[PDB]
Amino acid sequence: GAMATRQARRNRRRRWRERQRAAAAR
């Protein structure tokens, strides 16, 4: 969809956010 891309831009940014938790937090 057209909006799917809009919210998606935040998904990719969030996916990396929680991913850092592994390094930042033991």
Side-chain angles (χ1 to χ4, degrees):
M3 307 190 77
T5 53
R6 202 87 88 166
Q7 193 64 256
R9 202 82 71 182
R10 289 154 155 187
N11 279 231
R12 300 274 197 70
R13 289 174 161 187
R14 196 175 213 280
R15 209 187 185 178
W16 286 127
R17 210 283 201 162
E18 74 185 273
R19 271 290 180 173
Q20 210 168 106
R21 207 207 204 177
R26 286 179 187 75

